[PDB]
Amino acid sequence: EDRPSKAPSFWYKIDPSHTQGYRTVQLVWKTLPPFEANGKILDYEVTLTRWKSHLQNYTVNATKLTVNLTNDRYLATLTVRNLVGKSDAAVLTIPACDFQATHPVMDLKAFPKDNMLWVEWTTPRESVKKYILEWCVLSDKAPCITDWQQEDGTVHRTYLRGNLAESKCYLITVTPVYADGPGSPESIKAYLKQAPPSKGPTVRTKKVGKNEAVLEWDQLPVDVQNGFIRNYTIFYRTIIGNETAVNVDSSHTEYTLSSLTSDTLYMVRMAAYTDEGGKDGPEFTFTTPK
């Protein structure tokens, strides 16, 4: 048989340590797909070498390792081992603490097609070794827990290899990786599929005159949007009259109704719209003074 056929995908997250002078580094990798593992994975090995210092090695039986690094630059390697031998290594530079990330991807966009969420960008002008893509759902009913994947340096379009949901807003971040460290990240929001909002805006009067009323409302919580809100519509009518409808820019949170009749009972509601349709909020009432 054969040893594993490629290095695992390999990345890290870094934070300040409780110990002065150190950084807590969470090294992470993905279990190779079975076709690349070529047999039972026995374990992994990480090495860490600080510039002009002694190499540290760790045997790991898991897909994550937490280490304490100084503020210096490190070379990190990861190999996966099976009964036959060791894979080629995944290699990263973990830069010194004064490292300035530059050279982000340009023209980042994301869009659904064929039931996958595609992400594409213009390649940076530098030689990219590989890319890290990260994503999480934006929601007030669940924290942003990231999943991630790795791409070869020649890639400029790919799809997220997760099993995603419709009507959820994904925050997607693309980071180029260079020989000397990560590039600066860029992020975009996108939906695998949009739907009409689950709730409409709740409208209230700020001020009411004989012939005008100032309305205001809070923006919809992201969770209930189910897509990018493109615009609102205000519908209003005298108690005895026909309905009037006026469109409102999605970036606004106030609007003045005009040409109102004095001494009159008004009923009013608003709807919010995504590309897929709209949803009415609750009806509200006010009476103009005489």
Q: Distance between CA atoms of 180 and 4, rounded to whole angstroms? A: 27
Binding mask 61-100 for Cl ion (x = CB under 5 A): ----------------------------------------
Contacting range for Cl ion; rule: CB under 5 A; set: 170-178, 203-211, 232-240, 274-282: 203-211
Q: Is the CB of residue 260 less than 8 Å from the CB of residue 236?
A: no
* Token pair in block for residue 117: 């969420």
Count interface residues toward Cl ion (CB under 5 A): 9
The Cα–Cα gap between 173 and 254 comes to 33
Dihedral Cα 242, 243, 244, 246, nearest 10 deg? 180
Task: Determine the Cα angle at 214 with ends 212 and 219, to 5°.
Answer: 150
Work out whether 210 is an interface residue with Cl ion (CB under 5 A).
Answer: yes
Q: What are phi and psi of 37, to 5 degrees?
A: -65, -35
214 scored as a contact of Cl ion (CB under 5 A): no
Listed ranges 44-52, 94-102, 106-114, 189-197: which one lies at the site for Cl ion (CB under 5 A): 189-197
Rounded to the nearest whole angstrom, what is the least distance from the CB of residue 19 to Cl ion in the complex? 32
Question: Contact region for Cl ion (CB under 5 A) — 36-44, 102-110, 188-196, 244-252?
Answer: 188-196
Which segments of the chain does DSSP mark as H helices, in order?
A: 34-37, 222-225
User: Does residue 289 touch Cl ion according to CB under 5 A?
Assistant: no
Structure tokens at 33: 């797909």
Q: Could you tell me where the DSSP H helices lie in 121-274?
A: 222-225
Segment interacting with Cl ion, rule: CB under 5 A, options 7-15, 106-114, 168-176, 279-287: 7-15
Q: Which two tokens stand for residue 89?
A: 């290594």
Q: Does 108 bind Cl ion (CB under 5 A)?
A: no
**Would you say 227 and 274 are in contact if contact means Cβ atoms under 8 Å apart?**
yes
Any contact of residue 6 with Cl ion (CB under 5 A)? no
Kindly tell me which residue out of 96, 188, 195, 208 binds Cl ion, with binding defined by CB under 5 A: 188
> Nearest Cα to 263, choosing from 204, 210, 213, 207?
210
Among 43, 166, 212, 218, binds Cl ion (CB under 5 A): 212
Does 149 bind Cl ion (CB under 5 A)? Our answer is: yes
Residue (6 or 204) nearer to Cl ion, CB: 6
- 6/210 with CB nearer Cl ion: 210
User: Does residue 107 belong to the site contacting Cl ion (CB under 5 A)?
Assistant: no
Chain residues that interact with Cl ion, rule: CB under 5 A: 9, 149-150, 188-189, 209-212
